[PDB]
Specification:
By secondary structure, this protein is of the alpha+beta class. The protein is built from 16 helices and 12 strands. Bound molecules: protoporphyrin IX containing FE (HEM) and 6-deoxyerythronolide B. 6-deoxyerythronolide B binds next to α12. It catalyses: 6-deoxyerythronolide B + 2 reduced [2Fe-2S]-[ferredoxin] + O2 + 2 H(+) = erythronolide B + 2 oxidized [2Fe-2S]-[ferredoxin] + H2O.
Length: about 400
Amino acid sequence: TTVPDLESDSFHVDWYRTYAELRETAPVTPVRFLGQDAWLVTGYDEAKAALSDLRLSSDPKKKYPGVEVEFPAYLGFPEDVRNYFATNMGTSDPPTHTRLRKLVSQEFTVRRVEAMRPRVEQITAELLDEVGDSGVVDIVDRFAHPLPIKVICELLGVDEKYRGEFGRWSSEILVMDPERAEQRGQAAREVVNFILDLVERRRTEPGDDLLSALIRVQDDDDGRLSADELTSIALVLLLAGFETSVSLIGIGTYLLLTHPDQLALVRRDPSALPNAVEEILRYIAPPETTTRFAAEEVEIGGVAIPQYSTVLVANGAANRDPKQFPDPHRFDVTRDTRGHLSFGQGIHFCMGRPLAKLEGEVALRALFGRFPALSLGIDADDVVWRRSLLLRGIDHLPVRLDG
Ligand code: HEM
Ligand SMILES: CC[C@H]1OC(=O)[C@H](C)[C@@H](O)[C@H](C)[C@@H](O)[C@@H](C)C[C@@H](C)C(=O)[C@H](C)[C@@H](O)[C@H]1C
């Protein structure tokens, strides 16, 4: 009877209990969000099927007779701005998707990511060197945020003097508040103008960075990245390239800090960090929901999703489905996390997984290694969770360097 409003506090306050209640009733239920009807998928089997069903399109640019396609994530976005944000792998369906992903896969490799390991370690050490030996500091502004932003900038050839503004615009983009739709759309245009210039500079002065490489990437069959494709891929790589890791590092720091046994365990055993990263992602997936558009009627979990429906796959909620992950509310750094959906599922499976695990592992290892008595600077229940279903995270986290 009562259709859930994804804007309500129920989805930002102890929201996993809310997901649990829904999943129990119907793993595929109708919901309201940003003034339109949608379907929320909270069951694991259902979410995995949904992401595996190509009839559920990822392309917001496709047009359908009498329909006005509206992806929640592009709230306040002019059409040209949307196109700049949506002409990449994550916003494409095969065959376009296939060639774009393959072309980008030729340069965004494990080798290139591993080559960065030394940089990630040095950047991590320099940031930690600067916070001191004691007292309180905001681990986000001083570590979780600056590390990923510097790494992605180095990967995409973004000179130092051009790194002080986009962080602000990206932040605004993560929140989908109807009240600030205009400010959100304007932050998006700034990002677009920033990318257009970056591409211009890189075309004019090539380097050994990923963007320079993508500008040259080609293949007999796949062809190459068109100007629009190159610009849009660069844009997403920039944002998705750091915001996710910022969430991972912040949430991971908070989780380990608020779970004595898990904290104590990690401090005693190092080789437990890698799986901890996986469990941190399973427990509180940054990309809580991922959007899809039903190009045809699609039945998921026995529910007929009508054609033209907006579908929100609750990746995060799927990771807490007790049917897939027993005692889903227990943060256990030793649990077998195989199968979680925090990196997606299917053809759109995260392309940056290698880099994310590298950053998370290097960051958490260094932080908890450098400060053995690190502790939260506030009560666990007082942490402020970013109000976003697009990318969950923590934007301010006080910590006591010496306990
Ligand atoms: C912990 C960090 C990360 C998480 C949790 C994460 C998660 C995800 C998820 C859920 C998807 C699937 C989206 C969908 O199904 O529509 C995805 C796709 C993707 N991710 Fe990540 N990601 C992370 C880091 C990265 C990084 C560091 C980069 C860039 C350097 C990146 C680039 C991409 C790209 C380009 C895709 C598009 C895949 C495609 O459509 O073929 N990711 N990511
Ligand atoms: C504002 C809308 C966009 O969001 C962002 O770029 C966010 C900053 C990123 O954190 C998102 C959440 C990523 O981490 C991945 C899950 C998906 C990504 C790779 C896509 O391709 C996807 C089309 C995406 O660009 C849009 C949803």
